[PDB]
Design a protein around this ligand. Structure first.
Ligand SMILES: CCCCCCCCCCCCCCCCCC(=O)OC[C@H](COP(=O)([O-])OCC(O)COP(=O)([O-])OC[C@@H](COC(=O)CCCCCCCCCCCCCCCCC)OC(=O)CCCCCCCCCCCCCCCCC)OC(=O)CCCCCCCCCCCCCCCCC
Ligand SMILES: CCCCCCCCCCCCCCCCCC(=O)OC[C@H](COP(=O)([O-])OCC(O)COP(=O)([O-])OC[C@@H](COC(=O)CCCCCCCCCCCCCCCCC)OC(=O)CCCCCCCCCCCCCCCCC)OC(=O)CCCCCCCCCCCCCCCCC
Ligand SMILES: CCCCCCCCCCCCCCCC(=O)OC[C@H]1O[C@H](O[C@@H]2[C@H](O)[C@@H](O)[C@H](O)[C@@H](O[C@H]3O[C@H](CO)[C@@H](O)[C@H](O)[C@@H]3O)[C@@H]2OP(=O)(O)OC[C@@H](COC(=O)CCCCCCCC[C@H](C)CCCCCCCC)OC(=O)CCCCCCCCCCCCCCC)[C@@H](O)[C@@H](O)[C@@H]1O
Ligand SMILES: CCCCCCCCCCCCCCCC(=O)OC[C@H]1O[C@H](O[C@@H]2[C@H](O)[C@@H](O)[C@H](O)[C@@H](O[C@H]3O[C@H](CO)[C@@H](O)[C@H](O)[C@@H]3O)[C@@H]2OP(=O)(O)OC[C@@H](COC(=O)CCCCCCCC[C@H](C)CCCCCCCC)OC(=O)CCCCCCCCCCCCCCC)[C@@H](O)[C@@H](O)[C@@H]1O
Ligand code: HEA
Ligand SMILES: CC(C)=CCC/C(C)=C/CC/C(C)=C/CC/C(C)=C/CC/C(C)=C\CC/C(C)=C/CC/C(C)=C/CC/C(C)=C/CC/C(C)=C/CC1=C(C)C(=O)c2ccccc2C1=O
Ligand code: HEC
Ligand code: HEC
Ligand SMILES: CCCCCCCCCCCCCCCC(=O)O
Ligand code: FES
Ligand SMILES: [Ca+2]
Ligand SMILES: [Cu+2]
Ligand SMILES: [Cu+2]
Ligand SMILES: [Cu+2]
Ligand SMILES: [Mg+2]
Lengths: 146, 115, 153, 288, 223, 286, 139
């Protein structure tokens, strides 16, 4: 009964703290924003980082990111091989293409912000989250007797 | 057999899956061979053989009774693999190895089949 | 606690805490921290939903703004007989009560899908403070826990 | 089975590939498997051997020789077990081919004895004789296909495809379906005291016969074209699509064929024609 | 290590590529993507035998492992190099830490377990039933590293506890409690499984009442 | 006319296949004869020897005939003897294994895909030499019997693996399995064999060779062992081309061309033209 | 009872011949060794028939011709006293249920169920064996 067309195991999403949206013949995985926070907001003017992996299965594709929270700047080759992938961000844990954001509008962890990823053949909106990686818990000041 | 013949007449998978089809032919194969034929052999034996030889009874009647019940309960235990969320045996009646090892086919249906 | 502490597919139990209590070092705040932990209708489950699954959420006509992005908070008290319905399955998004086997749908407004439960779990509105801590936008807009004769309008 | 349960519950390193357990288990299983298929053959030979003389009004042609045929078939079916393992390329091919050829000699003797029994006598063809004749017709083709599998060159191309499925659904469908039904129709009055209907027991036979030959005949061709067994589905550009439709139609006919039989048994068990004699078949031979 | 990354890739294309993709991007309706999972997930899934899986049902069971320590490390390092994520804690000799994961305070671990983990698992870590065909297993077989990595990643319908939600000091106490509550003998006789009223009731009916009725039948008379 | 007598075997593309087809077609006739001469006997007595209107006495009660029973055990014995002789003759030829193959390729079977490796190439006329043997194989759950090469084609759930072989050359076909038993069957070869985890320890011979392939083209190959869930979804293709195209393809792959654009480099379709990848979804109800 | 004894030693002879042939033919010109799996089975299959054949031979040489073994015997020769047969008993089904319980216990690896099954089996077999030997109640 549990091994029919609808299965509880085959539809399970990976627990990765990121989105796995698709595009034109391109699959984007683990799309997240690095923005180490200190207060309720990350103020405009600060630069933040965009991280993901782009995969296709058979020979090249170009790409460009646009968004509404400031401007996105790319640095690198920014093309995909036949049976390979394009890694942009190096999330904490890995032992060169970089996506930087100027962030005209303030951001906060917990909400989703729309990003547009455009290729030479396909383009999608993603609505990415913010993820903190191997950063330890930040200290909270002690209370009093009350 | 009717189920697996219905889901074999058109190229696409219409209403079955791989796992269900595997269990289905495995259990068809086992039930038809071991729970129908091998038994029906002995039904015809203690129906006319005492009459044919001119005897009033079989050699051990109270042991003759035990065989039928062993048959019925063994068959029920083997078939009751369909109640599990996993399913019954899905490795054919032949049961080749290594496919029935703890690594491959780790389910509880296969265990009930064996026992 | 901060929104950054809990990640996608996690769940935490939270309690209402005011600045007026705190530490529990003295005897005055020692009996104030005990009432919080022994309250019948105090505990709340806070869940974070994966961003991929945010397009299949249904609201409850008056609770359309009770969530802070991809964080939701529900009562931890079963609406059947009051057991802590807290078995959270984070792939199927189901909340299971281990008392009488009623499960609730997290994607919808915690409405029952199986078991002897007939009513949905209550939601608590949440937001953030100027420092970046999680706070409430007021209490529930309905009674929480089991029902009684003079419940509802 | 105990050895396998030991591995699955205790981690007992019995059937490890490194330990030579991939072929140990196959030897152990096929020492059982083939004698098993000869357990459900000889008893149903007995039934037809008992039915022929009654309705033929003539003694069974060859009594001493049939016993020797049975003994030879049974004795031979112990040293023939690796003819199920040809593609493995790990058995002594000559040994299991010659003996498998030899286990096909006394079967022909049994066939010829049956033919000689039903030779030069008044035949009436009631339901038992009709079923027992269907048995002959099916089992001959079953055995003919079975002999082809015994030669390693042909099994190199045929094995583990629907050709074998076609084979063992003829050699197996004669003994435990046709002979079983023959026995049921034969011994129903002796066990109950009622007579099964005749107009309701011929529709059943004809439905079974037509359905069976409609569903299993084209499987040889399927296996020959390159359709392997135990496949859940196939591609549209595979060639074999229409044969599957024919097989399914035949299978549904074979599935609907069984309604009249069950209806007959249900109806005639308590409202059937009463037999008050000692033998309703007239020229019965045995002591029952 | 460069030589360790390539030996972990040849193990992957022979076992894992069918259900997870050639680029770890996931095969639709057979398996998810493996980008951003890290080597903690790999360690947990391969050491306990859950991977590789053999069919799609309600829940993939545990079974004997397919690989050994070296191969496990190779696979973990290959996966870690493709998106990052959590890592298994090591010891001073570069091996997997087992003894160092046991905490000091068992009482704090106990009451953390009772609040966070006793709902799905039992009081002391026995099984528990879930919605439809799913369940929470027994915790009496897992070594400290396995217990640590179970709640770091989130295998299935079990939630994930990040290092910010449960700091890597409370986790040590939790694992200490789990390891201790599994090797402590019963006081007052045979444990009867450790479930409570149901085994107790069955033991009563099948032992006490049987003995009483037998004694009564011996003392009394028939007809 | 041979089409309606071979019951739909493919025609061979190697000498051994043609010899096997000859043996099979010759045997089908020898089995229809003995079927006809028994069906005729059954039909004859079922239509002539019946209970006529004239109710005479019981017929002749004969039950023994020694001469006919004695001359009946010998007639099928000769038939099975001749069949055995021809069987032996054919089977000895189909397993020659000459110790000078011109190209040796490795075949490894794992959970629901194939992987091919060119072990070595050595033409008989000194036109091309290559050795793909790559000693670096790792062990322990040992898995040291497996073989690894420089050039390899890997099968994926979204791409059928295609094997490229020359025409008119010997092929060596060294088979191994990593996990379970699978079946290496090529219908056009009229030949299959089981691939086992540890052939050496199980007293199995896991190498077989052919003489030479007659014609160039694309042929299908299917798994036949019941290896698990996706056992009906484990397919491959063999594409036979001219020797010059073979060398060009080898050079392209040696430069590195993923096996998809090497075919495009030698003016061949990049994908399989006999089969296409199965739909990844479980079925039509999802 | 000579026919019964002869029927077994015929099979003994054939099985011995087959085992001896198989063992030698695999030692020479057969990959590996002796094929120990097939050799083991056929040397005990012969023993199966040998035991029964020897027992039947001894019994046949002990006792003289019976009514069953005489070509021309009368029906009135068999008149006398057959022996004991159980008219009815409900113990077999209990034995089968006990064994089924033990089997289900062993299948799912529940040691408590296995122990209960073994106890039930012992009790049921005790009940079956002692059925026609219990004396009247002593009061
Ligand atoms: C395995 C099955 C073994 C049974 C073999 C019986 C074949 C012989 C036929 C015969 O004489 O039948 C007598 C009789 C048949 O009844 P009947 O039809 O009235 O026959 C009238 C007799 O002429 C009247 O005869 P009687 O009243 O004079 O009684 C004679 C009979 C009974 O005399 C006795 O008192 C012998 C003891 C009884 C058998 C004890 C077996 C206990 C099994 C549990 C093991 C513990 C775990 O003698 C024997 O059966 C001799 C055989 C020696 C028994 C040794 C078996 C050891 C088992 C090995 C375990 C591994 O059967 C019995 O009394 C015993 C049969 C046991 C059947 C139980 C099957 C289930 C076993 C599951 C065990 C799994 C463990 C986990
Ligand atoms: C893991 C779960 C299992 C755990 C169980 C834990 C509880 C253990 C239960 C202990 C039984 C208490 C019995 C107290 C009396 C014992 C003193 C004695 O010698 O009485 C003689 C007494 C005869 O008294 P009577 O009134 O003169 O009866 C003569 C009539 O002719 C009799 O007329 P009848 O022909 O109607 O008699 C038929 C019946 C007579 O036997 C009984 O009545 C058995 C009583 C059981 C009733 C249980 C209720 C079941 C409800 C369903 O015989 C049988 O059917 C055979 C039963 C099997 C024999 C026991 C073998 C045990 C093996 C253990 C492994 O016979 C027995 O009760 C002997 C069976 C008891 C075995 C003694 C073992 C002692 C150690 C206990 C195990 C630790
Ligand atoms: C016993 C002999 C008598 C003969 C009668 C019966 C014999 C056989 C006939 C059975 C029919 C074929 C079954 C096999 C097909 C199958 O495998 O199925 C497909 C798939 O289905 C699931 O999904 C559905 C879709 O595929 C998905 O597309 C879809 O999304 C999903 O929708 C749910 O889920 C979504 C989220 O995904 C939500 O969006 C959505 O809202 C919803 O919730 C679907 O599921 P859902 O609708 O639940 O069920 C629907 C399935 C469910 O299967 C079933 O056959 C149900 C199984 C029960 C069978 C009935 C038992 C009858 C009882 C006994 C006769 C009584 C015993 C008495 C003893 C005799 C006493 C003697 C005196 O169709 C049916 O009912 C088929 C109808 C046929 C039944 C007819 C029987 C009743 C008539 C009475 C006759 C009496 C006889 C005698 C009287 C005198 C998937 O997940 C997988 O599992 C599964 O793969
Ligand atoms: C009037 C008389 C009244 C008195 C009668 C009392 C008699 C019974 C016992 C005797 C008293 C001895 C006192 C000393 C106590 C002692 O010194 O204490 C030992 C320890 O022992 C257990 O430790 C096992 C290991 O030693 C540990 O290493 C391990 O950790 C631990 O594992 C647990 O913990 C893990 C977490 O890590 C989990 O992973 C894991 O799963 C598990 O939970 C182990 O436990 P466990 O498996 O229980 O052992 C199984 C028991 C198994 O008992 C039993 O026979 C079962 C008794 C109850 C049966 C009643 C059930 C009723 C069922 C019904 C029939 C159902 C069907 C009917 C209904 C329907 C009807 C219609 C059909 O023995 C075995 O091993 C194998 C079987 C051999 C025992 C046989 C003795 C008696 C049998 C009676 C008959 C004799 C016949 C021959 C048999 C061989 C744990 O308890 C520990 O606390 C405890 O410390
Ligand atoms: C069930 C009953 C049954 C019977 C009676 C037989 C009888 C025979 N079987 Fe068996 N067989 C099976 C059941 C049976 N079989 C099953 C279930 C399988 C598949 C198991 C699995 O793998 O899943 C199987 C598989 C099987 C294989 C392995 C095929 C493979 O896996 O690829 C072989 C190979 O040697 C074989 C051969 C034979 C032979 C030679 C006979 C002979 O007994 C038949 C001989 C009959 C005749 C010869 C006709 C009468 C003779 C004459 C009229 C005289 C004519 C004389 C000449 C032609 C010389 N059968
Ligand atoms: C919820 C509900 C309504 C209940 C019914 C559910 C249901 C369908 C029941 C099936 C249970 C089984 C046996 C499942 C396996 C599959 C199967 C074999 C199905 C049926 C087979 C069949 C039809 C024919 C076989 C014939 C036959 C008589 C079978 C025997 C099966 C038996 C007797 C098994 C026991 C059944 C059962 C439900 C027992 C409950 C026992 C309980 C509740 C005890 C709990 C218990 C536990 C859990 C311990 O850990 C423990 C540890 C140490 C000592 C004691 C105990 C202990 O008592
Ligand atoms: C198809 C069947 C396979 C194969 C051949 C492998 N895996 Fe595994 N795997 C599969 C599924 C459907 C799932 C998801 C549901 C569940 O977890 O049971 C997984 C899961 C994993 C994970 C967990 C990832 C997560 O946290 O998101 C890992 C780490 C994993 N699988 C590893 C893995 C490895 C290393 C394999 C090669 C040996 C492998 N899987 C094979 C389905 C399948
Ligand atoms: C309900 C959901 C929960 C909760 C709240 C916890 N666990 Fe447990 N757990 C659960 C499931 C359904 C599974 C199985 C997943 C799989 O097999 O892929 C698990 C698994 C574990 C394991 C590993 C299993 C083992 O090898 O024994 C461990 C060690 C484990 N869970 C422990 C654990 C702890 C310490 C928890 C609270 C801190 C906890 N779980 C919560 C179900 C659930
Ligand atoms: C009689 C049962 C036929 C249907 C079998 C289908 C399998 C259901 C179990 C799943 O899992
Ligand atoms: S208390 Fe939650 S379901 Fe009854
Ligand atoms: Ca279909
Ligand atoms: Cu055979
Ligand atoms: Cu395969
Ligand atoms: Cu396969
Ligand atoms: Mg095969």
């Amino acid at each position: 009964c549990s091994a029919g067309q609808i299965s509880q195991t085959t539809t399970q999403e990976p627990a990765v703290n990121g989105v796995n949206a698709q595009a034109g013949q391109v699959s984007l995985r683990n799309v997240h924003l690095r923005a180490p926070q200190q207060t309720d907001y990350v103020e405009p003017g600060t630069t933040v980082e965009l991280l993901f992996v782009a995969a296709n299965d058979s020979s090249n594709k170009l790409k460009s990111i646009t968004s509404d929270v400031g401007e996105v700047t790319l640095t690198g080759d920014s093309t995909v091989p036949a049976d390979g992938v394009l890694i942009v961000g190096e999330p904490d844990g890995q032992i060169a293409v970089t996506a930087e954001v100027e962030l005209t509008k303030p951001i906060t962890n917990g909400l989703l912000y729309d990003f547009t990823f455009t290729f030479e053949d396909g383009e999608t909106t993603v609505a990415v989250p913010i993820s903190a990686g191997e950063q330890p818990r930040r200290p909270v000041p002690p209370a009093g007797p009350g | 057999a009717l189920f697996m013949r219905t889901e074999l007449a058109m190229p696409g998978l219409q209403f079955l899956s791989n796992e269900q089809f595997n269990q289905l032919f495995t259990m068809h194969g086992t039930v038809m061979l071991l729970f129908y034929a091998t038994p029906i052999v002995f039904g015809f034996a203690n129906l006319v053989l005492p009459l044919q030889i001119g005897a009033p009874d079989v050699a051990f009647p109270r042991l003759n009774a035990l065989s039928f019940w062993l048959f019925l309960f063994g068959a029920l235990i083997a078939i009751a693999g369909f109640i599990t969320p996993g399913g019954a045996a899905d490795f054919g009646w032949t049961a080749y190895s290594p496919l029935t090892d703890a690594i491959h086919s780790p389910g509880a249906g296969g265990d009930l089949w064996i026992m | 606690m901060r929104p950054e502490d809990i990640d996608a597919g996690g769940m935490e139990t939270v309690f209402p805490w005011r600045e007026s209590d705190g530490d529990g070092t003295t005897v005055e705040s020692e009996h104030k921290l005990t009432e919080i932990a022994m309250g019948v209708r105090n505990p709340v489950m806070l869940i974070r939903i994966k961003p991929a699954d945010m397009h299949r959420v249904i609201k409850r006509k008056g609770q359309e703004s009770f969530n802070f992005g991809e964080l939701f908070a529900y009562t931890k008290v079963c609406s059947h007989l009051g057991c802590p319905s807290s078995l959270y399955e984070q792939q199927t998004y189901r909340i299971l009560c281990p008392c009488h086997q009623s499960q609730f749908d997290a994607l919808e407004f915690a409405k029952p899908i199986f078991g002897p439960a007939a009513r949905a779990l209550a939601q608590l509105p949440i937001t953030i403070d100027e420092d970046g801590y999680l706070v409430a936008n007021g209490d529930f807009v309905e009674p929480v826990g089991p029902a009684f004769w003079e419940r509802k309008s | 089975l105990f050895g396998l349960a030991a591995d699955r519950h205790l981690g007992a390193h019995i059937y490890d590939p490194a330990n030579g357990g991939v072929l140990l288990w196959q030897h152990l299983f096929w020492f059982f498997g083939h004698p098993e298929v000869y357990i459900i053959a000889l008893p149903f030979f007995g039934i037809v051997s008992e039915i022929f003389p009654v309705f033929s009004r003539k003694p069974i042609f060859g009594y001493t020789t049939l016993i020797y045929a049975t003994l030879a078939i049974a004795a031979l079916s112990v040293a023939v077990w690796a003819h199920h393992m040809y593609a493995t390329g790990a058995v002594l091919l000559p040994f299991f081919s010659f003996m498998t050829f030899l286990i096909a000699v006394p079967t022909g003797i049994k066939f010829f004895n049956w033919i000689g029994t039903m030779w030069k006598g008044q035949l009436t063809f009631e339901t038992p004789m009709l079923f027992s004749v269907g048995f002959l017709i099916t089992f001959l083709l079953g055995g003919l296909s079975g002999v082809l599998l015994a030669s390693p060159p042909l099994d190199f191309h045929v094995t583990d495809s629907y050709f074998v499925i076609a084979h063992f659904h003829y050699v197996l469908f004669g003994t435990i379906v046709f002979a079983t039904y023959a026995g049921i129709y034969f011994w129903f009055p002796k066990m109950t005291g009622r007579l099964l209907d005749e107009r309701l027991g011929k529709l059943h036979f004809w439905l079974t016969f037509i359905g069976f030959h409609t569903t299993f005949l084209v499987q040889h061709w399927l296996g020959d074209e390159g359709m392997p067994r135990r496949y859940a589905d196939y591609l549209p550009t595979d060639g074999f699509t229409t044969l599957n439709v024919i097989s399914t139609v035949g299978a549904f006919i074979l599935g609907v064929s069984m309604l009249p039989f069950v209806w007959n048994v249900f109806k005639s068990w308590r409202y059937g024609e009463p037999v008050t004699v000692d033998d309703p078949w007239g020229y019965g031979n045995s002591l029952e | 290590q460069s030589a360790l990354l390539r030996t972990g890739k040849q193990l992957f294309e022979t076992s894992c590529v069918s259900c997870h993709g050639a680029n770890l991007q996931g095969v639709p309706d057979r398996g998810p993507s493996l980008i951003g999972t890290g080597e903690a997930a790999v360690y947990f899934q391969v050491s306990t035998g859950r991977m590789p899986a053999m069919r799609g049902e309600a829940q993939a069971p545990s079974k004997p492992p397919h690989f050994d320590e070296s191969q496990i490390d190779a696979l973990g390092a290959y996966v870690q190099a493709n998106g990052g994520g959590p890592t298994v804690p090591r010891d001073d000799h570069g091996a997997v830490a087992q003894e160092s994961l046991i905490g000091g305070d068992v009482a704090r671990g106990g009451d953390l377990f009772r609040l966070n983990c006793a709902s799905c698992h039992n009081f002391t870590g026995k099984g528990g039933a879930l919605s439809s065909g799913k369940y929470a297993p027994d915790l009496g077989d897992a070594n400290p590293a396995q217990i640590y990595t179970a709640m770091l990643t989130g295998p299935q319908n079990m939630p994930k506890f990040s290092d910010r939600q449960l700091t890597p000091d409370e986790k040590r106490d939790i694992v200490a409690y789990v390891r201790e509550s599994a090797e402590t003998p019963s006081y007052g006789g045979y444990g009867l499984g450790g479930f409570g009223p149901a085994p107790e009731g069955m033991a009563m009916w099948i032992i006490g009442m049987v003995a009483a009725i037998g004694v009564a039948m011996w003392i009394g008379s028939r007809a | 006319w041979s089409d309606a007598l071979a019951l739909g075997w493919p025609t061979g593309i190697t000498p051994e296949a043609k010899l096997n087809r000859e043996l099979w077609i010759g045997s089908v006739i020898a089995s229809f004869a003995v079927g006809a001469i028994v069906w005729g006997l059954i039909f004859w007595t079922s239509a002539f020897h019946r209970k006529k209107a004239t109710d005479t006495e019981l017929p002749r009660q004969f039950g023994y005939n020694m001469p006919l029973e004695l001359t009946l055990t010998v007639i099928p014995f000769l038939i099975i003897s001749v069949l055995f002789y021809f069987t032996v003759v054919v089977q000895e030829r189909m397993m020659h294994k000459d110790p000078n193959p011109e190209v040796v390729i490795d075949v490894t079977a794992f959970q629901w895909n194939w992987k091919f490796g060119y072990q070595k190439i050595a033409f008989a006329d000194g036109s091309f030499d290559y050795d793909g043997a790559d000693p670096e194989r790792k062990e322990a759950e040992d898995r040291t019997y497996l073989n690894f090469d420089k050039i390899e084609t890997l099968g994926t759930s979204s791409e059928i693996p295609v094997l490229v072989l020359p025409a008119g050359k010997r092929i060596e076909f060294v088979l191994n399995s990593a996990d379970v038993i699978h079946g290496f069957w090529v219908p056009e070869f009229l030949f299959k064999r089981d691939v086992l985890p540890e052939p050496k320890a199980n007293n199995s011979d896991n190498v077989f060779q052919v003489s030479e392939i007659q014609q160039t083209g694309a042929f299908v190959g299917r798994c036949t062992e019941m290896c698990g869930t996706f056992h009906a979804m484990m397919n491959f293709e063999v594409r036979v081309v001219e020797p010059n195209d073979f060398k060009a393809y080898i050079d392209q792959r040696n430069a590195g061309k993923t096996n998809a654009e090497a075919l495009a480099a030698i003016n061949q379709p990049p994908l399989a033209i006999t089969t296409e990848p199965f739909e990844s979804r479980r079925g039509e109800l999802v | 009872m000579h026919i019964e004894a002869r029927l077994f030693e015929i099979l003994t002879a054939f099985f011995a011949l087959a085992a001896v042939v198989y063992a030698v033919l695999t030692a020479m010109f057969a990959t590996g060794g002796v094929e120990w799996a097939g050799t083991t089975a056929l040397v005990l299959t012969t023993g199966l028939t040998l035991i029964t054949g020897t027992f039947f031979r001894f019994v046949a040489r002990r006792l003289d011709t019976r009514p069953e073994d005489y070509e021309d015997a009368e029906i009135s020769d068999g008149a006398g006293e057959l022996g004991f047969f159980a008219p009815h008993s409900w113990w077999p089904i209990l034995i089968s249920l006990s064994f089924s319980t033990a089997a289900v216990g062993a299948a799912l690896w529940l040691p408590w169920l296995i122990a209960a099954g073994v106890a039930f089996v012992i009790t049921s077999v005790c009940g079956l064996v002692f059925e026609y030997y219990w004396g009247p109640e002593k009061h």
